[PDB]
C-alpha cells in the first residue's frame, strides 16, 4: 500500500544524499552515454561511482557553506547563455528546457548555482596548495624557444604503407594504390586518425599517427621538401621510399612576428604547468577530503 | 608504576633457517664506545683498501681492510680541554672522497680529516647539527642539517658556498636525507615530505614534488619524512617517504611516473630491473623498475628493527637489532643463511664494496663479514 | 543491584518504597527506572518523584540538579510551578543548620547567599503562577526571607557602628532603605544612621533621619 | 498535485522529539500541493534538525508517512585498557565533547573525540597509542560507548642539545631544565618522559637564564623535536 517516495541513501557529515538526487545523476549519466554508450557501459560500478560523486559534492558544498562562499542571481544570469550552439539563450533556453527536465524553471538554476559554488571552492583550495617556481616555467619553455628557429612551426601527422626490402612491381603498385586511396579519402573529409589506425604500419598507428609540433627543417628531407608549400589542414600525397609510401597531414601551425634572437612564450608554459599542477593537487585534495570526512552508506 | 607494565605492540621471533654456506668474520676491531643507544648515521667507509670508522665520543680510526690492523687513530674532542673534553657527537656518516675524510657532528661542526695521517684539514660551522652523510660531488660537500638547511661546502677551502632552506614540520623523525648528484643537480628529500632538486652552481631550486600521502590529522599520522637517499637511474628518480609512497619521478620535470603505497626510512637498492626495499615494519620486498608490481615479499622479520639492505655477492644482506645478519635470495626472497655476529646489535648501514662487506655494531665493533 | 523486572514492576516497587518512606531505596529504584528507560511513559513522573525523594533525603545538590534538568527539558509542563516551589524549598533548606537550631542561634548573621537564591526562586514562582496552590506558602516564605536579609544588613551596620566606620554604616543603612524599606530591621537600623551622621558632624542629615524616625516612631 | 493531496501526516519512530517539534521542522503544512522536490526539502530540513539518524517519507496517496530513526541515546560510558590516564580525567573530557549519560550519541563526533584522546597520548609522549570507540546497540534505541585504550611504551628523551651556546655549556643550561636527558643511578624519583608544556616552560627558563646575565639579545632561532623511527627515542634540539 504505502509507496516509498524518497529516502536517505548516504549520510555525509551533517548533510545527506537523497535517492532522488542519485536517480537524477543516474539519468544524467544515462543521457550522456546515450550519445556513445561505450563511455559508461557499467551499471553497478557506475552506481557506486555516482554515489562517490554525490558524497564528494556534499562534502565540498558543506565546506563552502562553512567558509561562506555565495553566488547571486546576477552572477547566474548569462553564465549559461552564449554556450548552446547559436541558441537564443535566457528565452529559448528556458522554452527548450521545458521539454527535457524543466518541469520547474528554478530547478536548473538551483543546480547551476550549486555547481558554481563547488567549482569556486575547489579552485580556491586546490590553487592555494599550488606553488610554481619560475625556473620550472623557464625550463619548460626553453625547449620550444630553442626549437623556434623556423618562423612557423607545424603540427603534423604521418601514415606509412610498408614495403619489404626487395619489393615486387605488384607490391609497389598495391602500396601506391592503397596510399592514393587513403589520401583521396582524407581529402574527402575522412578522419585521418581512423585511417592511420586502420592502415598505417608506423609505430604511431595506434596513436592516430600524430607526430606533434615540429620544426620543418628538422623533419626527414622528403617531409621537409613536400611540406615546403603546405598549410594548415592540408593532405599531401604519398612519397616513395625504399621502405614504403609516406603520407603527411598538417593539423595546425603557430608563429609570431617577434624576433626570436623564448620571445613571449613562457606564458603558455605557465598555463600548461599550472593545469598539470592543478590536476595533481585536485586529485590529492579530493582524496584528502574523502578520508577526513564522515560518510555512511545506507543505500541498503 | 605502569612504565614497567607497559608492553610494546609486536616483535617477530627469530626465523629458523638452514645455512647453505658458512659465513665467517674475517676480523673485528673495536673503534671505541660506538654510537650507543643514540640513533645516528655513523657508519664505516671503504677507500683504497682502508677502512675509516668513528664513534660519538670523537675517536676516528683508519684500519687496514685486509686484516683490520690499525693504521692511525685520532680524537676530535676539545684539544685544550676547554670543557670536560666534551664529546664531538659525531653523527654524519663517515665519507671518504679524494684524500679527505668528511664527518658531521651534532655540534653543528663538519670535520675534514687527512687520509694520509688523520690531521684536521679543515673544520666548518654549519647552520645546525649535521645528521646526514656528507655527499661529495663537483668539488662540493653537501650537508643536510637538522633544521632543514642544505648547505654546500668547498672541498678544499671548507667555506660555505650556498644554502637552501627546506621547511621543517613541528614533529619529525630523527635523521636527514643525503642528496644525490645527477648532471649537476642535487636531489634531496625533506622532513616535510617533498623531494626537491637544486643546482650545484648556485643552489637554484629546479622543481619540488610532494611524495607523501599524509592521510591524517594528528601529528603521528602526518609524519612523512623523506629520510632516504633518492636513487637516480636513466633519468628517473626513485624516492620513498615514511608512511608515504615509493614514487618514481622524471629527473628533469619532477613529475610522478608511478606510485606505490610503501613507506620506510631505510635506504633501498635499485639494480637491473628490480627495487629491493625494506618496509618501515621491517619487511623485505622486491619490486619492478617499471612499476610497483611486487615480485616477492619476506615478512618473517617484522619489528626486528632491521638496517638498510646491501646487495653482496648477489644476495641481499640485512642486519638486525639483536645482532644477527640474514642473507636472502634475491630471486625468491628465501632466507639463505643466518649468523650471530655481535651482541649489541646493528642500527647503521652495512657497507659492500670491492668484494668486502663491513658493518659496525652499536658498541663500535667494526666487522668484516666474509663467506 | 536493581533487578531488571519489567518497567511496571520497578515503578510499583518505587512507589511502594516512597509510600513507606524509605527514601534511599526509592531513590535507587527511580534512578534505575530513569537510566534504563530514559524517554518513556514514566519519564516525567519519575523525574518529579526523584526531585521529591532527593529533597526528603537531604540530597539537596542532587535535587537542584534534577530541578534544573526538569525545568530546561519541560519548560511548559503543567506541573512546573511545583518544580519552582521545590527549588525554593531546596535553597531555603541549604540556609539551615540543625546543630545551631537546637541551641536557638539566630542565623541571620551567616551567609545570606542561599536565602537570596530562595527569595529569587519564590518570587519567580509567585509572579509567574499567581493562582498556583503553592503561592500562599511562597509568599510567607518570601516575607520571612526578606526579614532575614534585612537582619543580615542590620548586623553588618551594627558591627561597623561598633568599629567606628561611619561612612560604611551610612551606606549600609541607605542600602537597607533602598532594598528593604518595609522590614523591621530597617526601622531598627534608622537610629544607627542618625548616630553615624551625628558623629561625622553632618547635623542636617542627622536631623532629617531623626524626622523620619519620629514620623514612624512605632 | 504531483505528490497528491496530503490529507494527514503521520510520524513513526518518534521517541524523544515531540510530534509538534517535528511538524514545526518540516516546511510543508498539509499544503495539499506537494511535489517531489518539496519532499526532498522536507527530508533535508528534518535531518538538519540534528535529531535523526535516518529519515524516510512514504506516500499512501492521501497520507504522508514520515519514518524516522532517532539517533540513539547514551546508556553508559565504559573505559577499558587505559593504564595511565584515569577514568576521571577521561570522563570530564567526554562531557566537554557532549558525550554524557542520558544525552544523544553524535556519531559524527566519534572520530573527533578519538583523535583528541590520541593527541593527548602524543602530548605525554605515548606515541603508537590508539583509542578506538565501539558503539553497541542496546534495546529501546540506546547505545553503550566503550573506549578501548591500547597504550604503547612511553618514549624517553634520548638527548637535549643546544646549538650556539659559546658562553655557557650545555650541561649547565639543561641542569635547570624540567626535562631530563639522563637520570643518575641514585635518583630514582625522576624519569626521561616528554611533555609539550614542560618543553615550552623549559624554553622559557632558558630564555630567562640568558636574559638574567645581561645578554638582552638572546633569541631562540628554532626548536626541533625529532623521534626515532621506532617511536621510543624522542630527541630535542
Curated annotation (Swiss-Prot), chain A:
Keywords: Chaperone, Isomerase, Periplasm, Repeat, Rotamase, Signal. GO terms for molecular function: peptide binding; peptidyl-prolyl cis-trans isomerase activity; unfolded protein binding. PROSITE patterns: PPIC_PPIASE_1, PPIC_PPIASE_2. One of its GO terms (cellular component) is outer membrane-bounded periplasmic space. The keyword Signal applies. It catalyses: [protein]-peptidylproline (omega=180) = [protein]-peptidylproline (omega=0). It comes from the Bacteria. This is Chaperone SurA. It comes from Escherichia coli (strain K12).
From Swiss-Prot, chain B:
Keywords: Cell outer membrane, Lipoprotein, Membrane, Palmitate, Signal. GO terms for cellular component: Bam protein complex; cell outer membrane; membrane. One of its GO terms (molecular function) is identical protein binding. It is a lipid-anchor. Disulfide bonds: none annotated. Part of the Bam complex, which is composed of the outer membrane protein BamA, and four lipoproteins BamB, BamC, BamD and BamE. Monomer. Interacts directly with BamA. The Bam complex has the shape of a hat, with the BamA beta-barrel crown in the outer membrane and the periplasmic brim formed by the BamA POTRA domains and the 4 lipoproteins. Belongs to the BamB family. This is Outer membrane protein assembly factor BamB. The lineage of its organism: Bacteria, Pseudomonadati, Pseudomonadota, Gammaproteobacteria, Enterobacterales.
Swiss-Prot record, chain C:
The keyword Membrane applies. Its main location: membrane. Keywords: Cell outer membrane, Lipoprotein, Membrane, Palmitate, Signal. Part of the Bam complex, which is composed of the outer membrane protein BamA, and four lipoproteins BamB, BamC, BamD and BamE. Forms a subcomplex with BamC and BamE. Interacts directly with BamA. The Bam complex has the shape of a hat, with the BamA beta-barrel crown in the outer membrane and the periplasmic brim formed by the BamA POTRA domains and the 4 lipoproteins. InterPro entries: BamD, BamD-like, TPR-like_helical_dom_sf. Part of the outer membrane protein assembly complex (Bam), which is involved in assembly and insertion of beta-barrel proteins into the outer membrane. Constitutes, with BamA, the core component of the assembly machinery. Probably involved in transient protein interactions. Efficient substrate folding and insertion into the outer membrane requires all 5 subunits. Belongs to the BamD family. It is found in: Cell outer membrane. GO terms for cellular component: Bam protein complex; cell outer membrane; membrane. It is a lipid-anchor. It comes from Escherichia coli (strain K12). Pfam families: YfiO. Disruption phenotype: Depletion decreases the density of outer membrane proteins, but does not significantly affect transport of lipopolysaccharides to the outer membrane. This is Outer membrane protein assembly factor BamD. The gene is bamD. PROSITE patterns: PROKAR_LIPOPROTEIN (PS51257).
From Swiss-Prot, chain D:
Part of the outer membrane protein assembly complex (Bam), which is involved in assembly and insertion of beta-barrel proteins into the outer membrane. Constitutes, with BamD, the core component of the assembly machinery. Efficient substrate folding and insertion into the outer membrane requires all 5 subunits. A lateral gate may open between the first and last strands of the BamA beta-barrel that allows substrate to insert into the outer membrane; comparison of the structures of complete and nearly complete Bam complexes show there is considerable movement of all 5 proteins. (Microbial infection) Acts as a receptor for CdiA-EC93, the contact-dependent growth inhibition (CDI) effector of E.coli strain EC93; antibodies against extracellular epitopes decrease CDI. Its role in CDI is independent of the other Bam complex components. Is not the receptor for CdiA from E.coli strain 536 / UPEC, which does not have the same mode of toxicity as CdiA from strain EC93; the decreased expression of bamA101 in some experiments decreases the level of outer membrane proteins in general. Belongs to the BamA family. Changing residue 231 to A: Lethal, protein does not accumulate. Residues 4-71, 72-152, 155-237 form the POTRA domain. The gene is bamA. It is found in: Cell outer membrane. It comes from Escherichia coli (strain K12).
Amino acid at each position: 500500500a504505502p509507496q516509498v517516495v524518497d529516502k536517505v541513501a548516504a549520510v555525509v557529515n551533517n548533510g545527506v544524499v537523497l535517492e532522488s538526487d542519485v536517480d537524477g545523476l543516474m539519468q544524467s549519466v544515462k543521457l550522456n552515454a546515450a550519445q556513445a554508450r561505450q563511455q559508461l557501459p557499467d551499471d553497478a560500478t557506475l552506481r557506486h561511482q555516482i554515489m562517490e560523486r554525490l558524497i564528494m559534492d556534499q562534502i565540498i558544498l558543506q565546506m563552502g557553506q562553512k567558509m561562506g562562499v555565495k553566488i547571486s542571481d546576477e552572477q547566474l544570469d548569462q553564465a549559461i547563455a552564449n554556450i548552446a550552439k547559436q541558441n537564443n539563450m535566457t528565452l529559448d533556453q528556458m522554452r527548450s528546457r521545458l521539454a527535457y527536465d524543466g518541469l520547474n524553471y528554478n530547478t536548473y538554476r538551483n543546480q547551476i548555482r550549486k555547481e558554481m559554488i563547488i567549482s569556486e571552492v575547489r579552485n580556491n583550495e586546490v590553487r592555494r596548495r599550488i606553488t610554481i617556481l619560475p625556473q620550472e616555467v623557464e625550463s619548460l619553455a626553453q625547449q620550444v624557444g630553442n626549437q623556434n628557429d623556423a618562423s612557423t612551426e607545424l603540427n603534423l601527422s604521418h601514415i606509412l604503407i610498408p614495403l619489404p626490402e626487395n619489393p615486387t612491381s605488384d607490391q609497389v603498385n598495391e602500396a601506391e594504390s592503397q596510399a592514393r586511396a587513403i589520401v583521396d579519402q582524407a581529402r574527402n573529409g575522412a578522419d585521418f586518425g581512423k585511417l592511420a589506425i586502420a592502415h598505417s604500419a608506423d609505430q604511431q598507428a595506434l596513436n592516430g599517427g600524430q607526430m606533434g609540433w615540429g620544426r620543418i627543417q628538422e623533419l626527414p628531407g622528403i617531409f621537409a621538401q613536400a611540406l615546403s608549400t603546405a598549410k594548415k589542414g592540408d593532405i599531401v600525397g604519398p612519397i616513395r621510399s625504399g621502405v614504403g609510401f609516406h603520407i603527411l597531414k598538417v593539423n595546425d601551425l603557430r608563429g609570431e612576428s617577434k624576433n626570436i634572437s623564448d620571445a613571449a612564450q613562457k606564458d603558455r608554459a605557465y598555463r600548461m604547468l599550472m593545469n598539470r599542477k592543478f590536476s595533481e593537487e585536485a586529485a590529492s585534495w579530493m582524496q584528502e577530503q574523502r578520508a577526513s570526512a564522515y560518510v555512511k552508506i545506507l543505500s541498503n | 608504576l605502569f612504565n614497567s607494565e607497559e608492553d610494546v605492540v609486536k616483535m617477530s621471533p627469530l626465523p629458523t633457517v638452514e645455512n647453505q654456506f658458512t659465513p665467517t668474520t674475517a676480523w673485528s676491531t673495536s673503534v671505541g664506545s660506538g654510537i650507543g643507544n643514540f640513533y645516528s648515521n655513523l657508519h664505516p667507509a671503504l677507500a683504497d683498501n682502508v677502512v675509516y670508522a668513528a664513534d660519538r665520543a670523537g675517536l676516528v680510526k683508519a684500519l687496514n681492510a685486509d686484516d683490520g690492523k690499525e693504521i692511525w687513530s685520532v680524537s676530535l674532542a676539545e684539544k685544550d680541554g676547554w670543557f670536560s673534553k666534551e664529546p664531538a657527537l659525531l653523527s654524519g656518516g663517515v665519507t671518504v672522497s679524494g684524500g679527505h675524510v668528511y664527518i658531521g657532528s651534532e655540534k653543528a661542526q663538519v670535520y675534514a680529516l687527512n687520509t694520509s695521517d688523520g690531521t684536521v684539514a679543515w673544520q666548518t660551522k654549519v647552520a645546525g647539527e649535521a645528521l646526514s652523510r656528507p655527499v661529495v660531488s663537483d668539488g662540493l660537500v653537501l650537508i643536510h642539517t637538522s633544521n632543514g638547511q642544505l648547505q654546500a661546502l668547498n672541498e678544499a677551502d671548507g667555506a660555505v658556498k650556498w644554502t637552501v632552506n627546506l621547511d621543517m614540520p613541528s614533529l619529525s623523525l630523527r635523521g636527514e636525507s643525503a642528496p644525490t648528484t645527477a648532471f649537476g643537480a642535487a636531489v634531496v628529500g625533506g622532513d616535510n615530505g617533498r623531494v626537491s632538486a637544486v643546482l650545484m652552481e648556485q643552489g637554484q631550486m629546479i622543481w619540488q614534488q610532494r611524495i607523501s600521502q599524509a592521510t591524517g590529522s594528528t601529528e603521528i599520522d602526518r609524519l612523512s619524512d623523506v629520510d632516504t637517499t633518492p636513487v637516480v637511474v636513466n633519468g628517473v628518480v626513485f624516492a620513498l617517504a615514511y608512511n608515504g609512497n615509493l614514487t618514481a619521478l622524471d629527473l628533469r620535470s619532477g613529475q610522478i611516473m608511478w606510485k606505490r603505497e610503501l613507506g620506510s626510512v631505510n635506504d633501498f637498492i635499485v639494480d637491473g630491473n628490480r627495487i629491493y626495499l625494506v618496509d618501515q615494519n621491517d619487511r623485505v620486498m622486491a619490486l619492478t623498475i617499471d612499476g610497483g608490481v611486487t615480485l616477492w615479499t619476506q615478512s618473517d622479520l617484522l619489528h626486528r628493527l632491521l638496517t638498510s639492505p646491501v646487495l653482496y655477492n648477489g644476495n641481499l644482506v640485512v642486519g638486525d637489532s639483536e645482532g644477527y645478519l640474514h642473507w636472502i635470495n634475491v630471486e625468491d626472497g628465501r632466507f639463505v643463511a643466518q649468523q650471530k655476529v655481535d651482541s649489541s646489535g646493528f642500527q647503521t648501514e652495512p657497507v659492500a664494496a670491492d668484494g668486502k662487506l663491513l658493518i659496525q655494531a652499536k658498541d663500535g665493533t667494526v666487522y668484516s663479514i666474509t663467506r | 543491584e536493581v533487578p531488571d523486572n519489567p518497567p511496571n514492576e520497578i515503578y510499583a516497587t518505587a512507589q511502594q518504597k516512597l509510600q513507606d518512606g524509605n527514601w534511599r531505596q526509592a531513590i535507587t529504584q527511580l534512578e534505575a527506572l530513569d537510566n534504563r528507560y530514559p524517554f518513556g511513559p514514566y519519564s516525567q513522573q519519575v523525574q518529579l518523584d526523584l526531585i521529591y525523594a532527593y529533597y526528603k533525603n537531604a540530597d539537596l545538590p542532587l535535587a537542584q540538579a534534577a530541578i534544573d534538568r526538569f525545568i530546561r527539558l519541560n519548560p511548559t509542563h503543567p506541573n512546573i510551578d511545583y518544580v519552582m516551589y521545590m527549588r525554593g524549598l531546596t535553597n531555603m533548606a541549604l540556609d539551615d543548620s540543625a546543630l545551631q537550631g537546637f541551641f536557638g542561634v539566630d542565623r541571620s548573621d551567616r551567609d545570606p547567599q542561599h536565602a537570596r537564591a530562595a527569595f529569587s526562586d519564590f518570587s519567580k514562582l509567585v509572579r509567574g503562577y499567581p493562582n498556583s496552590q503553592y503561592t500562599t506558602d511562597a509568599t510567607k516564605r518570601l516575607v520571612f526571607l526578606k526579614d532575614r536579609l534585612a537582619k543580615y544588613e542590620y548586623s553588618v551596620a551594627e558591627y561597623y557602628t561598633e568599629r567606628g566606620a561611619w561612612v560604611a554604616v551610612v551606606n549600609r543603612v541607605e542600602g537597607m532603605l533602598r532594598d528593604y524599606p518595609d522590614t523591621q530591621a530597617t526601622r531598627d537600623a534608622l537610629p544607627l544612621m542618625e548616630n553615624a551622621y551625628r558623629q561625622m558632624q553632618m547635623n542636617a542629615q542627622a536631623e532629617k533621619v531623626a524626622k523620619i524616625i519620629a514620623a514612624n516612631s512605632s | 498535485a504531483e505528490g497528491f493531496v496530503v490529507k494527514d501526516i503521520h510520524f513513526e519512530g518518534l521517541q524523544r522529539v515531540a510530534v509538534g517539534a517535528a511538524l514545526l521542522s518540516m516546511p510543508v503544512r498539509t499544503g495539499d500541493t506537494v511535489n517531489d522536490e518539496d519532499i526532498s526539502n522536507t527530508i533535508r530540513a528534518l535531518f538538519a534538525t540534528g535529531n535523526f539518524e535516518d529519515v524516510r517519507v512514504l506516500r499512501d496517496g492521501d497520507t504522508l508517512l514520515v519514518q524516522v530513526k532517532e539517533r540513539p541515546t547514551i546508556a553508559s560510558i565504559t573505559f577499558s585498557g587505559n593504564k595511565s590516564v584515569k577514568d576521571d580525567m577521561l570522563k570530564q573530557n567526554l562531557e566537554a565533547s557532549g558525550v554524557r549519560v542520558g544525552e544523544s550519541l553524535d556519531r559524527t563526533t566519534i572520530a573527533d573525540i578519538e583523535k583528541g584522546l590520541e593527541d593527548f597520548y602524543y602530548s605525554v609522549g605515548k606515541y603508537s597509542a590508539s583509542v578506538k570507540a565501539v558503539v553497541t546497540p542496546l534495546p529501546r534505541n540506546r547505545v553503550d560507548l566503550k573506549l578501548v585504550f591500547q597504550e604503547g611504551v612511553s618514549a624517553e628523551i634520548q638527548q637535549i642539545n643546544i646549538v650556539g651556546n659559546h658562553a655557557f655549556t650545555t650541561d649547565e643550561l639543561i641542569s635547570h631544565f624540567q626535562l631530563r636527558d639522563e637520570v643518575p643511578w641514585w635518583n630514582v624519583v625522576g624519569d626521561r618522559k616528554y611533555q609539550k608544556q614542560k618543553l615550552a616552560g623549559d624554553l622559557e627558563t632558558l630564555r630567562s637564564y640568558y636574559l638574567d646575565r645581561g645578554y638582552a639579545r638572546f633569541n631562540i632561532d628554532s626548536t626541533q623535536v625529532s623521534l626515532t623511527p621506532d617511536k621510543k627515542g624522542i630527541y630535542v634540539t
